[PDB]
């Protein structure tokens, strides 16, 4: 019952032998300012990966 | 996120595109040569009157090279003058060997670099090349570094 209980995908070529997927992330903040302002907080991002066989 | 370099390496010009400041509302008393330190002798109507550095003065900036304002080759009396008050700039020197990196420079008469053992002021930036059987150094000028004695 494994193939009927869990979902099945087909997104690999038969010659392929490894695969990977990526996950991302973010940071940041905000403040209260005035009209004449020269500094503001900044934001960025990240990334990660995993493998298979 | 980086700062670009500026290639021509002649005395009196700027060496980098880091944060700089150019005080262009000035006039000259006497004659000044590109790449020399200047001092402020007075202020008239929001204009600063500058002269070449004497003994006992406090340097304010370094004369800056321009190819429209100064057609002669140097800055002449009664001319509007460009002065660099903040940034990296090539200066004339009488020294023989490069001083330690980030040391404190000392200015002899006429606005030339002759010391590398000062107490406070402008600092050596790491550039040392040769000009005309003389040398050129690279100085980092900051705005409030030298304070006029009471």
């Amino acid at each position: 019952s494994a193939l009927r209980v869990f979902p099945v995908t087909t997104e690999l070529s038969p010659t392929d032998k490894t695969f990977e997927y990526m996950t991302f992330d973010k940071v940041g903040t905000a403040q209260i300012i005035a009209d004449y302002t020269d500094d503001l907080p900044l934001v960025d991002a990240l990334g990660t990966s995993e493998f298979g066989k | 996120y980086e700062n670009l370099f500026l290639r021509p390496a002649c005395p009196g010009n700027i060496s980098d595109t880091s944060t700089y400041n150019i005080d262009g509302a000035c006039v000259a008393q006497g004659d000044i040569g590109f790449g020399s330190a200047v001092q402020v002798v007075g202020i008239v109507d929001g204009v600063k009157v500058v002269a070449a550095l004497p003994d006992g003065g406090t340097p304010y900036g370094i004369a800056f090279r321009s190819q429209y304002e100064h057609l002669s080759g140097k800055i002449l009396d009664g001319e509007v003058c460009n002065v660099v008050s903040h940034g990296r700039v090539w200066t004339l020197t009488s020294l023989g060997e490069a001083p330690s990196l980030f040391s404190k420079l000392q200015f002899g008469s006429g606005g030339v670099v002759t010391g590398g053992s000062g107490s406070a002021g402008w600092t050596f930036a790491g550039g040392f090349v040769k000009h005309e059987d003389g040398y050129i150094i690279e100085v980092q000028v900051k705005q409030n570094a030298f304070i006029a004695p009471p």
């Binding site: 990526m22 940041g28 903040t29 905000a30 300012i33 503001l40 900044l42 934001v43 | 996120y1």
Partner: protein, 212 residues
């Protein structure tokens, strides 16, 4: 009314660099700013800011606060105390405005939905069903901001009447982008918006039950 803002940086090298899949880094950085602005608006509404003289909804000095016995005492459910206190709060809202306002909305912590799902003894329908049958015309919801109300694990329940003439939030200017300001080899994009916080016109139509 107050103004809000931030900014982000990006470089030509990263812009030109390509990836296998996913949204571009510029789009992700631009979405991060909007998320931060929305979260700051929510935090101003639910937490306040002392230096800016913004008063939160839990710290308002003119609303009615009710001390309560704990609904859960060391994994010992009390499904009658909750109903009694909710009825008390509704009756308090009814009798404090002299009949001009009736309670319509309840907000409870998400972890206390198990107390209201208990079957009443010797029957089938639950305490929540009985409460709805006796008080048809009210809406009950769950908010995660109520799990902690003072930073030390204090819980609470909020009972109020949702009506624009009693309280509202103003957002005069929407979130927007400003053109990038180029530097030597990178760019910079600022983002701005406006808000006001929470204002209450009639502080007698809100009841906060603390200690739950």
């Amino acid at each position: 009314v107050f103004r809000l803002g931030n900014a982000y940086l990006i470089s030509i090298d990263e812009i030109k660099a390509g990836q296998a899949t996913g949204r571009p880094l510029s789009t992700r950085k631009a979405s991060a700013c909007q998320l931060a602005h929305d979260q700051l608006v929510n935090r101003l509404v639910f937490k306040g800011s002392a230096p800016h003289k913004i008063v939160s909804v839990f710290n308002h000095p003119n609303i009615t606060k009710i001390t309560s016995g704990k609904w859960i005492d060391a994994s010992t459910m009390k499904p009658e105390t909750a109903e009694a206190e909710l009825t008390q709060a509704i009756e308090t809202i009814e009798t404090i405005t002299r009949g001009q306002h009736r309670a319509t909305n309840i907000l409870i912590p998400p972890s206390m939905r198990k107390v209201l799902a208990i079957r009443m003894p010797e029957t089938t329908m639950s305490y929540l069903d009985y409460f709805k049958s006796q008080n048809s015309g009210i809406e009950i919801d769950s908010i995660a901001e109520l799990e902690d109300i003072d930073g030390a694990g204090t819980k609470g329940v909020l009972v109020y009447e949702k009506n624009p003439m009693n309280m509202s939030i103003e957002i005069p200017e929407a979130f927007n982008m400003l053109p990038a300001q180029p530097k030597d080899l990178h760019f910079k994009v600022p983002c701005t918006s406006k808000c006001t916080g929470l204002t209450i016109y009639r502080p007698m139509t809100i009841v906060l039950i603390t200690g739950v």
